[PDB]
């Protein structure tokens, strides 16, 4: 099951403007909760979440850079999962970034 969100690159906090069912089911947060949150998805952060990984994802968004970052995330129920976050900038003809697609894959459980 694919898990992904789409972020608005033209607002300061890169707000989530779409999230698919797979993503919501993965992390245990409903679409209503996820929508309009910064697409870094800090609400998934917990004890094992590496500062360096979080920083690297944030960097990719700032610099509109395509990048895969593997990071420990937490579902609503507290379970930890190692997640490969795939940051994909989508630019127009001019070269401006219009949105980001972020894909999430579970690497392994806990």
Author numbering: 26 to 135
Article sentences:
The KCNH family of voltage gated potassium channels includes the EAG (ether-a-go-go) channels, the ERG (eag related gene) channels and the ELK (eag like K+) channels; these channels have roles in cardiac repolarization, neuronal excitability, cell differentiation and tumor growth. A defining characteristic of KCNH channels is their large N- and C-terminal cytoplasmic regions. The N-terminus typically includes a Per-Arnt-Sim (PAS) domain, while the C-terminal region includes a domain that strongly resembles cyclic nucleotide binding domains, but which has been shown to have little affinity for cyclic nucleotides. As already stated, the role of PAS domains in KCNH channels is unknown; it is not known if these domains bind small ligands or mediate interactions between the channel and other proteins.
